[PDB]
Amino acid sequence: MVGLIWAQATSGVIGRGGDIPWRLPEDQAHFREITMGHTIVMGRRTWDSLPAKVRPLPGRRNVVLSRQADFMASGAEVVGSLEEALTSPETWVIGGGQVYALALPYATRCEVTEVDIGLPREAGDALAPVLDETWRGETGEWRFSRSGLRYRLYSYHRS
Numbered sequence: 181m182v183g184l185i186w187a188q189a190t191s192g193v194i195g196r197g198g199d200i201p202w203r204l205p206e207d208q209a210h211f212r213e214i215t216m217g218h219t220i221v222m223g224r225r226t227w228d229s230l231p232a233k234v235r236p237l238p239g240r241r242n243v244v245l246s247r248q249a250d251f252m253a254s255g256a257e258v259v260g261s262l263e264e265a266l267t268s269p270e271t272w273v274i275g276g277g278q279v280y281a282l283a284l285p286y287a288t289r290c291e292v293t294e295v296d297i298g299l300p301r302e303a304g305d306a307l308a309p310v311l312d313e314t315w316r317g318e319t320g321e322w323r324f325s326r327s328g329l330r331y332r333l334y335s336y337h338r339s
């Protein structure tokens with residue numbers, strides 16, 4: 181099984197300036213809950229985007245895609261392709277616009293957090309992948325963060 185998990189603004193924006201344009205602790209919790217104890221796959225840029233104190237992501241087998249051969253990611257496995265990175269029976273892809281798009285054709289689950297912030301898609305934005313008609317979605321209800329950010333959860337699966 182290969183799962184994708186991400187948090188996006190309604191517009192599909194997941195990242196800008198090498199960072200995420202919001203803070204939603206409830207989403208961190210969700211991300212942590214789902215990926216804990218599993219293999220995670222992330223782009224080199226996601227790795228670099230991780231605050232120092234949560235890299236490698238504790239409690240998960242960290243795998244980082246990079247084309248750079250000298251690239252070292254302390255406490256993670258650096259690999260040069262998705263197919264070397266998808267070796268584990270249940271891998272969560274957590275890891276970058278570029279990487280969701282590579283990983284998409286292999287995935288059978290997605291966990292999406294939608295954050296209710298108006299943020300136009302911009303050139304350079306890391307963006308969420310589009311799920312075509314092969315996918316079946318379950319949409320959760322809007323909630324309010326302790327921080328007043330409205331957000332909701334979607335779960336997607338397919339044959």
Ligand SMILES: NC(=O)C1=CN([C@@H]2O[C@H](COP(=O)(O)OP(=O)(O)OC[C@H]3O[C@@H](n4cnc5c(N)ncnc54)[C@H](OP(=O)(O)O)[C@@H]3O)[C@@H](O)[C@H]2O)C=CC1
Pocket residue numbers: 185186187188194195196197198199200222223224225226227229245246247248251259260261262274275276277278279280282306307
């Ligand atoms: N809201 C959320 O859920 C998401 C938030 N984000 C945000 O997304 C952004 C990062 O995403 P993005 O900018 O798209 O970068 P990515 O995380 O998708 O990683 C891009 C890097 O991954 C490597 N990679 C790309 N595809 C391949 C391939 N086919 N073979 C070998 N290596 C490959 C390259 O590494 P290299 O250049 O070293 O060769 C490339 O530079 C950041 O802003 C981050 O904060 C991060 C994850 C989750």
Ligand SMILES: COc1cc(NCc2ccc3[nH+]c(N)nc(N)c3c2C)cc(OC)c1OC
Pocket residue numbers: 185186187200207208210211226229230231234273274275291292293
């Ligand atoms: C800037 O501060 C932080 C930034 C990040 N970025 C990576 C990150 C953040 C939210 C996420 N939310 C979902 N639904 N899925 C993901 N794939 C995801 C990822 C991959 C992760 C952190 O901890 C996990 C953190 O501090 C705790």
